[PDB]
């Protein structure tokens, strides 16, 4: 009876090098969990043909499937190519509370295995679990030892707990074909999703954050700012900080309204208006945020992972070079900045992704994980995610 969607919800996905078995593993997980606990099994074919989705003005091929263990509900993402994972991870089009890294026992880690882990750490993927695949092809119980060692070392190399990482030895294809012994491995995998990935924190449970859009005054009552609560809850009577652009100001929520109905609190996802005590319209501006005090600071420089739109995605036709000073769109506003490409790199081609160190003209309230768009006179050229705030 979870049509009421009462079970804990977790967003996961398969990552790893092309042809290591991510799509087969995904089909296998839905099929085996369906047989064991009931559900919709999905074939390779339907998951493989990933439909196009629009993230941040960016087209990505993503397949979504869901599945259930007795205790949880999972929304799971799988992509055809490497570019899809790059764009998905940077724009955060698909939420990842945890990732299942598929590594072909026959090949061992490969270029994309490393990039996915690196990007995973850069965009904040919290947990990773490994499914060492194609074990039906490798009976050398010793060579399986080496791969696991390689993967564990690889994970730690990128700051994931390699020694404690759950690694399942299995065969997606054979479990998907009904091979009972292999199907047990799929269940072992799902048990680790259950036991290793802690239930994700609800946006509604995170510190209050509301990006400011409009600001108007109400004769007598005060200054109100509008916006959609990004996370948390703001109750009437609580203090808030107005962060970014200008120096940080303090204020108190003296009222909340939505659809003209006064509320005693504003919740994540709602488009509300917030009445602020003792703040004039001139002090507040679009681009700042209302936040739970002490939870977010303004920063001008940061390390980021950015994806430059291809010509077809409606991006540039030509590459850009250092000296480039585009507009960085954070939540509700643009802020020009200075870029520093990696050592020795002079240009970035459309379709490329690289780490970029940015320096904004004025501060913006930010933290690791904040997504942003890059643009040239309105026209979107890239998407990025803050990896590390520098100052």
């Amino acid at each position: 009876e979870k049509f009421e969607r009462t079970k804990p919800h977790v967003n996961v996905g398969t990552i790893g090098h092309v042809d290591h078995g991510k799509t087969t593993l995904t089909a296998a997980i839905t099929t085996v969990l369906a047989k064991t606990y009931g559900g919709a099994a999905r074939a390779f074919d339907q998951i493989d043909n990933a439909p196009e989705e629009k993230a941040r003005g960016i087209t990505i091929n993503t397949s979504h499937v869901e599945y259930d263990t007795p205790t949880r509900h999972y929304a799971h993402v799988d992509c055809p190519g490497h570019a899809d994972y790059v764009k998905n991870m940077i724009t955060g089009a698909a939420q990842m509370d945890g990732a299942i890294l598929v590594v072909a026992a026959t090949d061992g880690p490969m270029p994309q295995t490393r990039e996915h882990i690196l990007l995973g750490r850069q965009v904040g993927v919290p947990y990773i679990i490994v499914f060492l695949n194609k074990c039906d092809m490798v009976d050398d119980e010793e060579l399986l030892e080496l791969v696991e060692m390689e993967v564990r070392e690889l994970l730690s190399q990128y700051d994931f707990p390699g020694d404690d990482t759950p690694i399942v030895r299995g065969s997606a294809l054979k479990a998907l074909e009904g091979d009972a012994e292999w199907e047990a491995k799929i269940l072992e995998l799902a048990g680790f999703l259950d036991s290793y990935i802690p239930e994700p924190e609800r946006a509604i449970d995170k510190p209050f954050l509301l990006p400011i859009e409009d600001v108007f005054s109400i004769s007598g009552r005060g200054t109100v700012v509008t916006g959609r609560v990004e996370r948390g809850i703001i109750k009437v009577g609580e203090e808030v900080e107005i962060v970014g652009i200008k120096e940080t100001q303090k204020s108190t929520c003296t009222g909340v309204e939505m659809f003209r109905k006064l509320l005693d609190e504003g919740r994540a996802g709602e488009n509300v208006g917030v009445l602020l005590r003792g703040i004039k319209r001139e002090e507040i501006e679009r681009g700042q945020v209302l936040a739970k005090p002490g939870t977010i600071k303004p920063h001008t420089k940061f390390e980021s992972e950015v994806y430059i739109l291809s010509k077809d995605e409606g991006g540039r036709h030509t590459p850009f070079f250092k000296g480039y000073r585009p507009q960085f769109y954070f939540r509700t506003t643009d802020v020009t900045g200075t870029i520093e490409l990696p050592e020795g790199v002079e240009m970035v081609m459309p379709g490329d992704n690289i780490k970029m160190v940015v320096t904004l003209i004025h501060p913006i309230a930010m933290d690791d994980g904040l997504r942003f768009a890059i643009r040239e006179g309105g026209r979107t050229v890239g998407a990025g995610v803050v990896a590390k705030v520098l100052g």
């Binding site: 109400i218 005060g222 003296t254 009222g255 309204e257 488009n271 208006g273 917030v274």
Partner: peptide
């Protein structure tokens, strides 16, 4: 405020 089904807006 100023909204009413789902666009930016308010009151207080």
């Amino acid at each position: 405020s100023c909204n009413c089904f789902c666009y930016p807006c308010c009151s207080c």
